[PDB]
Design a protein around this ligand. Sequence first.
Ligand SMILES: [Zn+2]
Length: 263
Amino acid sequence: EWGYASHNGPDHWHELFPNAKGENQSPIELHTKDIRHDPSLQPWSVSYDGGSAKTILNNGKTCRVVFDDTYDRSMLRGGPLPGPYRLRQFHLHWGSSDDHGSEHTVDGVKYAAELHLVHWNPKYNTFKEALKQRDGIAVIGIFLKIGHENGEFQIFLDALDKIKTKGKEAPFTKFDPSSLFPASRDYWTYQGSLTTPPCEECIVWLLLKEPMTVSSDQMAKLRSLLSSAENEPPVPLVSNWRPPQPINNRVVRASFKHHHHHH
Ligand SMILES: [Zn+2]
């Protein structure tokens, strides 16, 4: 029903998914000039359970790791959130070359990829119901910058051989996503939507200022996945990112100061 191919990509989502036409769509372009510091933004923290990781999969649109969220195992709390959130899954977005691939951009700079750790509020009883709330989902977004190879990330990349084609999935346990977190927890926050259909505007975004580094080699591994089935002819899965959407009247807030634009 949707994808990143020229016939079902971002340019066509609006006529298939009404929400994609909304006023609080994601991603957006971040401009530090217009970002205001909000002392109310408290530090966020995680209580992830490595043993909660269950499956890794390739649905032809991205590669996703699923966690056990039947109860409060891996939690995300603090920050602008109204309560604790359950880690449900994480996936990535990347481009065809290292010069681009991230969905959000900062002051014109684009990254090679973007990691999204998706959580939801248990207060809404069910993940499906959380998608109906403006703050039902909280996503931790991490930028991937080209540089030194990442050892922790390599573990993830090593499992990719199991889900090369669309539809493939494999047991993937023992993995703490927090090991991929950069040293700084400074973040930007705003409210938007899923950057993928149905594009519900139900996400409270937490974008980390400090990017995660990865080597060009490791990025090449991500681009080796297929969006095609084991039968169908090979079709590489690259460019699974959505262009920036109009910010409209939304203001992005920072948990840190950044004195550059003022005094
Ligand atoms: Zn995403």
